[PDB]
mmCIF file of C-alpha atoms and ligand atoms in Angstrom:
data_model
loop_
_atom_site.group_PDB
_atom_site.id
_atom_site.type_symbol
_atom_site.label_atom_id
_atom_site.label_comp_id
_atom_site.label_asym_id
_atom_site.label_seq_id
_atom_site.Cartn_x
_atom_site.Cartn_y
_atom_site.Cartn_z
ATOM 1 C CA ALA A 12 14.545 -15.606 -3.760
ATOM 2 C CA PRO A 13 12.444 -15.019 -7.307
ATOM 3 C CA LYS A 14 10.534 -17.809 -8.152
ATOM 4 C CA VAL A 15 8.128 -18.840 -11.400
ATOM 5 C CA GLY A 16 4.728 -18.001 -11.800
ATOM 6 C CA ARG A 17 3.901 -14.298 -9.508
ATOM 7 C CA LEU A 18 0.813 -12.310 -10.487
ATOM 8 C CA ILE A 19 0.391 -8.668 -8.957
ATOM 9 C CA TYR A 20 -3.021 -8.873 -7.938
ATOM 10 C CA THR A 21 -4.896 -5.836 -7.334
ATOM 11 C CA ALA A 22 -7.914 -5.493 -5.226
ATOM 12 C CA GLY A 23 -10.497 -2.746 -4.503
ATOM 13 C CA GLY A 24 -10.093 0.413 -5.456
ATOM 14 C CA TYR A 25 -12.550 4.062 -6.123
ATOM 15 C CA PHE A 26 -14.223 4.915 -9.676
ATOM 16 C CA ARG A 27 -17.400 6.775 -8.841
ATOM 17 C CA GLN A 28 -17.604 3.946 -5.717
ATOM 18 C CA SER A 29 -16.250 1.759 -4.187
ATOM 19 C CA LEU A 30 -14.986 -1.412 -5.879
ATOM 20 C CA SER A 31 -15.035 -5.207 -5.643
ATOM 21 C CA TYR A 32 -12.302 -6.079 -8.081
ATOM 22 C CA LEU A 33 -9.917 -8.912 -7.954
ATOM 23 C CA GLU A 34 -7.578 -8.874 -11.118
ATOM 24 C CA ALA A 35 -3.846 -10.108 -11.453
ATOM 25 C CA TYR A 36 -1.419 -9.039 -14.354
ATOM 26 C CA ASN A 37 0.692 -11.374 -15.162
ATOM 27 C CA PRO A 38 4.191 -9.746 -16.245
ATOM 28 C CA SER A 39 5.385 -12.440 -18.150
ATOM 29 C CA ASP A 40 3.121 -12.402 -20.710
ATOM 30 C CA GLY A 41 0.858 -8.843 -20.272
ATOM 31 C CA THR A 42 -2.157 -10.435 -18.884
ATOM 32 C CA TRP A 43 -5.236 -9.662 -17.083
ATOM 33 C CA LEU A 44 -7.028 -12.634 -15.014
ATOM 34 C CA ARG A 45 -10.853 -11.056 -13.224
ATOM 35 C CA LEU A 46 -10.738 -13.146 -10.430
ATOM 36 C CA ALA A 47 -13.095 -13.707 -7.310
ATOM 37 C CA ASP A 48 -14.763 -10.288 -6.640
ATOM 38 C CA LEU A 49 -14.182 -9.048 -2.770
ATOM 39 C CA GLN A 50 -16.977 -9.900 -0.450
ATOM 40 C CA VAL A 51 -17.804 -5.984 0.659
ATOM 41 C CA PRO A 52 -16.426 -3.211 -2.061
ATOM 42 C CA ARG A 53 -13.613 -0.960 -0.499
ATOM 43 C CA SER A 54 -11.371 1.718 -1.411
ATOM 44 C CA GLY A 55 -8.497 3.400 0.756
ATOM 45 C CA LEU A 56 -8.014 -0.392 2.109
ATOM 46 C CA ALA A 57 -4.203 -2.178 1.559
ATOM 47 C CA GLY A 58 -3.152 -5.884 0.303
ATOM 48 C CA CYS A 59 0.111 -8.110 1.245
ATOM 49 C CA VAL A 60 0.657 -11.775 1.782
ATOM 50 C CA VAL A 61 1.707 -14.032 3.683
ATOM 51 C CA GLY A 62 1.978 -18.012 3.056
ATOM 52 C CA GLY A 63 1.030 -17.769 -0.380
ATOM 53 C CA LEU A 64 -2.305 -15.835 0.817
ATOM 54 C CA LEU A 65 -3.543 -12.685 -0.116
ATOM 55 C CA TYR A 66 -5.125 -10.360 2.202
ATOM 56 C CA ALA A 67 -7.098 -7.446 2.198
ATOM 57 C CA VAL A 68 -7.205 -5.504 4.922
ATOM 58 C CA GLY A 69 -9.443 -2.180 6.020
ATOM 59 C CA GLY A 70 -10.634 0.830 3.562
ATOM 60 C CA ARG A 71 -14.068 2.069 3.243
ATOM 61 C CA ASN A 72 -17.286 0.947 1.373
ATOM 62 C CA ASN A 73 -18.355 4.571 -0.115
ATOM 63 C CA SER A 74 -21.596 2.862 -1.618
ATOM 64 C CA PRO A 75 -24.840 4.428 -3.372
ATOM 65 C CA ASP A 76 -26.596 4.138 0.609
ATOM 66 C CA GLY A 77 -23.684 5.046 2.920
ATOM 67 C CA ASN A 78 -19.577 5.887 3.720
ATOM 68 C CA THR A 79 -18.919 2.488 6.331
ATOM 69 C CA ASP A 80 -15.224 2.284 7.605
ATOM 70 C CA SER A 81 -13.683 -1.071 7.125
ATOM 71 C CA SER A 82 -12.021 -3.180 10.240
ATOM 72 C CA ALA A 83 -11.975 -5.921 8.456
ATOM 73 C CA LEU A 84 -9.802 -8.506 7.217
ATOM 74 C CA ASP A 85 -10.546 -11.028 4.377
ATOM 75 C CA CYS A 86 -7.965 -13.518 2.994
ATOM 76 C CA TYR A 87 -8.125 -14.834 -0.567
ATOM 77 C CA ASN A 88 -6.859 -18.147 -1.787
ATOM 78 C CA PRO A 89 -5.197 -18.226 -5.310
ATOM 79 C CA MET A 90 -5.669 -22.113 -5.019
ATOM 80 C CA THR A 91 -9.400 -22.042 -4.369
ATOM 81 C CA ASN A 92 -10.086 -18.737 -5.746
ATOM 82 C CA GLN A 93 -11.950 -17.778 -2.881
ATOM 83 C CA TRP A 94 -12.509 -14.951 -0.220
ATOM 84 C CA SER A 95 -12.380 -16.209 3.774
ATOM 85 C CA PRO A 96 -12.985 -14.058 6.187
ATOM 86 C CA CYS A 97 -10.556 -13.092 9.236
ATOM 87 C CA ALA A 98 -10.970 -11.802 12.390
ATOM 88 C CA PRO A 99 -11.476 -8.018 12.029
ATOM 89 C CA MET A 100 -9.048 -4.985 13.637
ATOM 90 C CA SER A 101 -9.543 -3.669 16.780
ATOM 91 C CA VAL A 102 -10.702 -0.219 14.934
ATOM 92 C CA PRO A 103 -11.783 0.757 11.626
ATOM 93 C CA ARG A 104 -8.814 1.886 9.133
ATOM 94 C CA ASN A 105 -9.827 3.670 5.917
ATOM 95 C CA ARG A 106 -6.769 4.899 4.227
ATOM 96 C CA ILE A 107 -4.533 2.359 5.754
ATOM 97 C CA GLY A 108 -0.848 0.975 5.666
ATOM 98 C CA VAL A 109 -0.130 -2.327 6.216
ATOM 99 C CA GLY A 110 3.491 -4.643 6.528
ATOM 100 C CA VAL A 111 4.410 -7.826 7.251
ATOM 101 C CA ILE A 112 7.801 -8.740 9.436
ATOM 102 C CA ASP A 113 8.398 -12.912 10.266
ATOM 103 C CA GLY A 114 4.536 -13.946 8.418
ATOM 104 C CA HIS A 115 2.640 -10.922 10.942
ATOM 105 C CA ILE A 116 0.712 -8.241 9.351
ATOM 106 C CA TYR A 117 1.184 -5.127 10.883
ATOM 107 C CA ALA A 118 -2.145 -2.243 10.760
ATOM 108 C CA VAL A 119 -0.760 1.232 10.232
ATOM 109 C CA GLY A 120 -2.976 4.745 11.109
ATOM 110 C CA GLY A 121 -6.165 5.052 9.333
ATOM 111 C CA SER A 122 -9.065 7.195 9.162
ATOM 112 C CA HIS A 123 -12.610 6.575 11.253
ATOM 113 C CA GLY A 124 -15.077 9.203 10.246
ATOM 114 C CA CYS A 125 -13.142 12.251 11.756
ATOM 115 C CA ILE A 126 -10.728 10.010 14.029
ATOM 116 C CA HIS A 127 -7.366 10.141 12.271
ATOM 117 C CA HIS A 128 -5.354 6.746 14.150
ATOM 118 C CA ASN A 129 -1.913 7.055 15.423
ATOM 119 C CA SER A 130 -2.892 3.400 16.509
ATOM 120 C CA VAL A 131 -0.991 0.040 15.141
ATOM 121 C CA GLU A 132 -2.214 -3.416 15.500
ATOM 122 C CA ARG A 133 -0.459 -6.689 14.609
ATOM 123 C CA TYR A 134 -2.152 -9.967 13.255
ATOM 124 C CA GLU A 135 -0.854 -13.454 13.542
ATOM 125 C CA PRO A 136 -2.450 -15.647 10.660
ATOM 126 C CA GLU A 137 -2.241 -18.944 12.425
ATOM 127 C CA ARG A 138 -3.881 -17.717 15.784
ATOM 128 C CA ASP A 139 -6.534 -15.635 13.551
ATOM 129 C CA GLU A 140 -6.265 -13.184 16.019
ATOM 130 C CA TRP A 141 -5.340 -8.987 15.953
ATOM 131 C CA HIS A 142 -3.373 -7.151 18.642
ATOM 132 C CA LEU A 143 -2.400 -3.433 19.338
ATOM 133 C CA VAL A 144 1.093 -2.756 19.379
ATOM 134 C CA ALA A 145 2.795 0.994 20.487
ATOM 135 C CA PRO A 146 1.215 3.575 18.340
ATOM 136 C CA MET A 147 3.198 5.715 16.057
ATOM 137 C CA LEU A 148 4.545 9.105 17.174
ATOM 138 C CA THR A 149 2.592 10.839 14.743
ATOM 139 C CA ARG A 150 -1.400 10.221 13.256
ATOM 140 C CA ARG A 151 -1.365 9.346 9.522
ATOM 141 C CA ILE A 152 -4.015 8.718 7.257
ATOM 142 C CA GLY A 153 -2.994 7.803 3.703
ATOM 143 C CA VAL A 154 0.227 6.477 4.857
ATOM 144 C CA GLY A 155 3.030 4.185 3.229
ATOM 145 C CA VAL A 156 4.210 1.582 4.992
ATOM 146 C CA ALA A 157 6.781 -1.109 4.026
ATOM 147 C CA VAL A 158 9.536 -3.249 5.786
ATOM 148 C CA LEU A 159 13.189 -3.587 5.624
ATOM 149 C CA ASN A 160 15.539 -5.958 7.412
ATOM 150 C CA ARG A 161 12.606 -6.897 9.907
ATOM 151 C CA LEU A 162 11.977 -2.580 10.501
ATOM 152 C CA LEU A 163 8.960 -1.318 9.638
ATOM 153 C CA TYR A 164 8.474 2.007 7.915
ATOM 154 C CA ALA A 165 5.487 4.600 8.109
ATOM 155 C CA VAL A 166 5.828 7.278 6.024
ATOM 156 C CA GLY A 167 3.597 10.931 5.385
ATOM 157 C CA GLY A 168 0.534 11.036 4.801
ATOM 158 C CA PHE A 169 -2.217 13.007 6.304
ATOM 159 C CA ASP A 170 -2.958 13.997 10.102
ATOM 160 C CA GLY A 171 -6.288 15.578 9.613
ATOM 161 C CA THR A 172 -4.775 19.544 9.138
ATOM 162 C CA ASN A 173 -1.579 19.075 7.216
ATOM 163 C CA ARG A 174 -0.324 16.461 4.970
ATOM 164 C CA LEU A 175 3.133 15.148 5.941
ATOM 165 C CA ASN A 176 6.440 14.725 4.628
ATOM 166 C CA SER A 177 7.663 13.141 8.056
ATOM 167 C CA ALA A 178 8.432 9.597 8.813
ATOM 168 C CA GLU A 179 8.815 7.091 11.429
ATOM 169 C CA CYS A 180 10.382 3.105 11.945
ATOM 170 C CA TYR A 181 9.267 0.534 14.432
ATOM 171 C CA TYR A 182 11.667 -1.644 15.626
ATOM 172 C CA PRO A 183 10.199 -5.196 17.166
ATOM 173 C CA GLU A 184 12.130 -5.993 19.744
ATOM 174 C CA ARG A 185 11.579 -2.588 21.521
ATOM 175 C CA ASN A 186 7.928 -2.117 20.462
ATOM 176 C CA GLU A 187 9.187 1.254 20.284
ATOM 177 C CA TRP A 188 8.514 4.032 16.948
ATOM 178 C CA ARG A 189 11.614 6.325 16.476
ATOM 179 C CA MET A 190 11.348 9.139 14.105
ATOM 180 C CA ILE A 191 13.734 9.087 11.256
ATOM 181 C CA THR A 192 14.720 11.831 8.469
ATOM 182 C CA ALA A 193 11.716 13.490 6.974
ATOM 183 C CA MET A 194 11.394 13.234 3.290
ATOM 184 C CA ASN A 195 12.471 16.256 0.459
ATOM 185 C CA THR A 196 8.780 16.182 -0.132
ATOM 186 C CA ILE A 197 5.240 16.193 1.785
ATOM 187 C CA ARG A 198 3.412 12.947 0.696
ATOM 188 C CA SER A 199 -0.271 11.799 1.510
ATOM 189 C CA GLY A 200 -0.990 9.069 -0.800
ATOM 190 C CA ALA A 201 1.985 7.927 -1.829
ATOM 191 C CA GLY A 202 3.042 4.290 -3.052
ATOM 192 C CA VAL A 203 5.623 3.407 0.014
ATOM 193 C CA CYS A 204 7.778 0.505 -0.741
ATOM 194 C CA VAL A 205 11.250 -1.575 -0.777
ATOM 195 C CA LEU A 206 14.145 -2.374 -2.713
ATOM 196 C CA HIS A 207 17.549 -3.129 -2.356
ATOM 197 C CA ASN A 208 18.608 -1.473 1.048
ATOM 198 C CA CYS A 209 15.985 1.508 0.468
ATOM 199 C CA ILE A 210 12.322 2.329 1.220
ATOM 200 C CA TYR A 211 10.909 3.905 -2.066
ATOM 201 C CA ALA A 212 7.928 6.771 -2.121
ATOM 202 C CA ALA A 213 6.244 7.537 -5.431
ATOM 203 C CA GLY A 214 3.770 9.924 -5.984
ATOM 204 C CA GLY A 215 1.376 11.349 -3.615
ATOM 205 C CA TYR A 216 -0.247 14.404 -2.731
ATOM 206 C CA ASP A 217 0.874 17.745 -1.099
ATOM 207 C CA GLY A 218 -2.236 19.553 -0.293
ATOM 208 C CA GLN A 219 -2.236 21.722 -3.402
ATOM 209 C CA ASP A 220 -0.988 19.077 -6.180
ATOM 210 C CA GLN A 221 -0.765 15.434 -7.084
ATOM 211 C CA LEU A 222 2.944 14.418 -8.017
ATOM 212 C CA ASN A 223 5.065 12.673 -9.972
ATOM 213 C CA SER A 224 8.185 12.764 -8.061
ATOM 214 C CA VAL A 225 10.021 9.736 -6.376
ATOM 215 C CA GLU A 226 12.599 9.272 -3.255
ATOM 216 C CA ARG A 227 13.756 6.273 -1.982
ATOM 217 C CA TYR A 228 14.750 6.521 1.841
ATOM 218 C CA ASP A 229 18.746 4.659 2.577
ATOM 219 C CA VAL A 230 18.520 2.948 5.786
ATOM 220 C CA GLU A 231 22.350 2.802 6.341
ATOM 221 C CA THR A 232 23.450 6.577 5.361
ATOM 222 C CA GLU A 233 19.712 7.803 6.515
ATOM 223 C CA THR A 234 18.929 10.196 3.468
ATOM 224 C CA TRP A 235 16.568 10.461 1.034
ATOM 225 C CA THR A 236 17.129 11.387 -2.609
ATOM 226 C CA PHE A 237 15.147 11.920 -5.414
ATOM 227 C CA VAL A 238 14.947 8.723 -8.620
ATOM 228 C CA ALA A 239 13.919 9.261 -11.826
ATOM 229 C CA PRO A 240 10.405 11.162 -11.911
ATOM 230 C CA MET A 241 6.851 8.591 -12.944
ATOM 231 C CA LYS A 242 6.043 9.757 -16.041
ATOM 232 C CA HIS A 243 2.479 10.225 -14.607
ATOM 233 C CA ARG A 244 1.683 12.479 -11.692
ATOM 234 C CA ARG A 245 -0.674 10.271 -9.226
ATOM 235 C CA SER A 246 -1.900 9.961 -5.338
ATOM 236 C CA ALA A 247 -3.906 7.368 -3.928
ATOM 237 C CA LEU A 248 -1.784 4.567 -6.236
ATOM 238 C CA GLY A 249 -1.037 0.621 -6.004
ATOM 239 C CA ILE A 250 2.751 -0.438 -5.466
ATOM 240 C CA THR A 251 4.725 -3.448 -5.428
ATOM 241 C CA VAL A 252 7.798 -4.807 -6.175
ATOM 242 C CA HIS A 253 8.465 -7.847 -8.274
ATOM 243 C CA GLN A 254 11.862 -8.554 -10.285
ATOM 244 C CA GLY A 255 13.714 -6.540 -8.782
ATOM 245 C CA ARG A 256 11.634 -3.360 -9.906
ATOM 246 C CA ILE A 257 8.497 -1.253 -8.676
ATOM 247 C CA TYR A 258 5.194 -1.293 -10.187
ATOM 248 C CA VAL A 259 2.778 1.423 -9.559
ATOM 249 C CA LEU A 260 -0.398 1.026 -10.358
ATOM 250 C CA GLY A 261 -3.217 2.847 -10.988
ATOM 251 C CA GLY A 262 -4.462 6.330 -8.814
ATOM 252 C CA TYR A 263 -5.811 9.787 -9.659
ATOM 253 C CA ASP A 264 -3.991 13.258 -10.584
ATOM 254 C CA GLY A 265 -7.009 15.946 -9.996
ATOM 255 C CA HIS A 266 -8.772 15.061 -13.885
ATOM 256 C CA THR A 267 -8.317 11.290 -14.204
ATOM 257 C CA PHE A 268 -9.154 7.877 -12.044
ATOM 258 C CA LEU A 269 -5.463 6.140 -13.835
ATOM 259 C CA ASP A 270 -5.450 2.735 -15.383
ATOM 260 C CA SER A 271 -2.129 3.818 -16.202
ATOM 261 C CA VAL A 272 0.994 1.101 -15.114
ATOM 262 C CA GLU A 273 4.586 2.445 -14.747
ATOM 263 C CA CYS A 274 7.265 -0.139 -13.552
ATOM 264 C CA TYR A 275 10.784 1.431 -12.664
ATOM 265 C CA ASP A 276 14.025 -0.301 -13.482
ATOM 266 C CA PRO A 277 16.829 0.847 -10.660
ATOM 267 C CA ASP A 278 19.755 -0.342 -12.833
ATOM 268 C CA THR A 279 18.486 2.485 -15.437
ATOM 269 C CA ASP A 280 16.744 4.743 -13.032
ATOM 270 C CA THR A 281 14.293 4.879 -15.808
ATOM 271 C CA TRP A 282 10.286 4.363 -15.439
ATOM 272 C CA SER A 283 8.539 2.483 -18.395
ATOM 273 C CA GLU A 284 4.756 1.755 -19.483
ATOM 274 C CA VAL A 285 4.095 -1.796 -19.211
ATOM 275 C CA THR A 286 0.502 -2.167 -19.117
ATOM 276 C CA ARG A 287 -3.235 -0.318 -18.580
ATOM 277 C CA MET A 288 -5.539 -1.985 -15.779
ATOM 278 C CA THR A 289 -8.934 -2.901 -17.039
ATOM 279 C CA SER A 290 -10.455 0.357 -15.614
ATOM 280 C CA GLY A 291 -9.049 3.359 -13.985
ATOM 281 C CA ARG A 292 -9.103 3.714 -10.420
ATOM 282 C CA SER A 293 -7.482 4.580 -7.132
ATOM 283 C CA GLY A 294 -7.120 3.357 -3.469
ATOM 284 C CA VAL A 295 -6.422 0.104 -4.533
ATOM 285 C CA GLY A 296 -4.604 -2.329 -2.691
ATOM 286 C CA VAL A 297 -1.438 -4.813 -4.374
ATOM 287 C CA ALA A 298 0.362 -7.646 -3.858
ATOM 288 C CA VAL A 299 2.143 -10.297 -4.689
ATOM 289 C CA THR A 300 1.828 -13.956 -5.208
ATOM 290 C CA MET A 301 1.795 -17.304 -6.926
ATOM 291 C CA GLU A 302 -1.257 -17.633 -10.023
ATOM 292 C CA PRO A 303 -4.502 -19.182 -9.226
ATOM 293 C CA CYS A 304 -4.993 -22.592 -10.164
HETATM 294 C C1 LIG B 401 -12.843 13.055 -6.896
HETATM 295 C C2 LIG B 401 -12.885 12.379 -5.510
HETATM 296 O O1 LIG B 401 -12.333 11.312 -5.554
HETATM 297 C C3 LIG B 401 -12.675 10.511 -4.653
HETATM 298 C C4 LIG B 401 -13.362 10.672 -3.882
HETATM 299 C C5 LIG B 401 -13.546 9.273 -2.727
HETATM 300 C C6 LIG B 401 -12.337 8.644 -2.759
HETATM 301 N N1 LIG B 401 -11.135 8.737 -3.816
HETATM 302 C C7 LIG B 401 -11.254 9.652 -4.321
HETATM 303 C C8 LIG B 401 -10.051 10.052 -5.236
HETATM 304 C C9 LIG B 401 -9.136 11.025 -4.422
HETATM 305 C C10 LIG B 401 -9.153 12.071 -4.395
HETATM 306 C C11 LIG B 401 -8.539 12.995 -4.093
HETATM 307 C C12 LIG B 401 -6.481 12.469 -3.787
HETATM 308 C C13 LIG B 401 -5.727 13.195 -3.084
HETATM 309 F F1 LIG B 401 -5.034 13.187 -3.802
HETATM 310 C C14 LIG B 401 -4.725 12.496 -1.590
HETATM 311 O O2 LIG B 401 -3.759 11.720 -1.947
HETATM 312 N N2 LIG B 401 -5.700 12.245 -0.555
HETATM 313 C C15 LIG B 401 -5.750 11.175 0.625
HETATM 314 C C16 LIG B 401 -5.696 10.594 -0.165
HETATM 315 C C17 LIG B 401 -4.149 9.161 0.401
HETATM 316 C C18 LIG B 401 -4.964 7.423 0.461
HETATM 317 C C19 LIG B 401 -5.719 7.269 -0.045
HETATM 318 C C20 LIG B 401 -5.793 5.367 -0.858
HETATM 319 C C21 LIG B 401 -6.853 8.477 -0.896
HETATM 320 C C22 LIG B 401 -6.738 9.945 -0.487
HETATM 321 C C23 LIG B 401 -5.931 12.536 1.900
HETATM 322 C C24 LIG B 401 -6.062 11.600 2.772
HETATM 323 C C25 LIG B 401 -5.784 13.991 2.013
HETATM 324 O O3 LIG B 401 -4.262 13.884 1.936
HETATM 325 O O4 LIG B 401 -6.598 14.407 2.016
HETATM 326 C C26 LIG B 401 -6.504 10.937 -3.911
HETATM 327 C C27 LIG B 401 -7.679 9.949 -4.311
#
C-alpha cells in the first residue's frame, strides 16, 4: 500500500479572495513545490486522486469583481504539470465534500447561493460523465466526506440554519443513504478522513467557536470517541492521510488564516507540528499522489 515518492498536494483556498495555488509538500524532506496554478481561483473546493491524477472539484471564486459558485471539475497530471478541464457537475457546489469509491468520484452537498444541497452526483473518469445518485437525508454544506470499506460517509456540515453533529452513510449497492450515530460535537467545516477502521472528524465550527477537538467513528462498534485534540483550533481545514498519519492543513480560527500543518500519530495519540504552508489560507482541497516529473 505504501510507495516512495508521494506528496501532499494542496489546491486553492481563501485569503482575502479565492486562490489559484497548487503546492505540494514532501514529508520525506520537508520541502514545498509550487506547481501550475489552477485555471480559475477557487475556495471551498475538494481534492481527490484517481489513477494518479489529482482532481479539484467545486468551490467558489470569491474575487474582486464577483462571487461565482463552481460546478467545475479539473484534473492535474503530475507528469505534465498541467490542468485539464473535465465535464462539469450538474449544479455549482461551494463548500463541497468528495470521496472516491472504486475509481469514481462522489460530489456531496455544498451550496449555490442560498441553496443548500442534499444532492449527490458521481463522476466516471474514463467516460468523463457525471450522474446523480441518491440524495442525502440532510442538506449539508461544509460537509466532511470519507470512504472506508467501499462505503461513503457524509459528516456534519451546515443545513442553512443549524450546524450539524449528524452523519450518514451511502451504501452503493442499494443506492441508499442511512443515518449513522451522531458525533459528540456539532461540526461544520471539519476535516474528515479515514484511518484504519475509523472515520475521523477534526476541528470545524459549532456556530460559536472553531474547534480543536477530534473524534473518530468506529464503523464496527458505531461509536464516536474523542482522541487527542489538535494544538490549534481550526475550521475549513484541509486534511489527508499519508503513511498511517493524519495531516491537517491551514484553516481559520476567527483571528488568523492558519499556515499551520499538524500531523496525528494514532499509535501514540499525539499531534506534532510538521511544516507551515507558504501562506495562511482556509478552504483548500487536499490529496496525495506521486511527485511531479
Ligand atoms: C473572515 C472571512 O472569512 C472567510 C470569508 C470567505 C471565505 N472563507 C472565510 C474563512 C472562514 C470563515 C468562517 C468559517 C467558519 F468557521 C466555518 O467553518 N463555516 C462553515 C464553513 C465550512 C467549510 C468551509 C470550506 C468554509 C466555511 C460554514 C458552512 C458555516 O457553518 O457557516 C470558516 C472559514
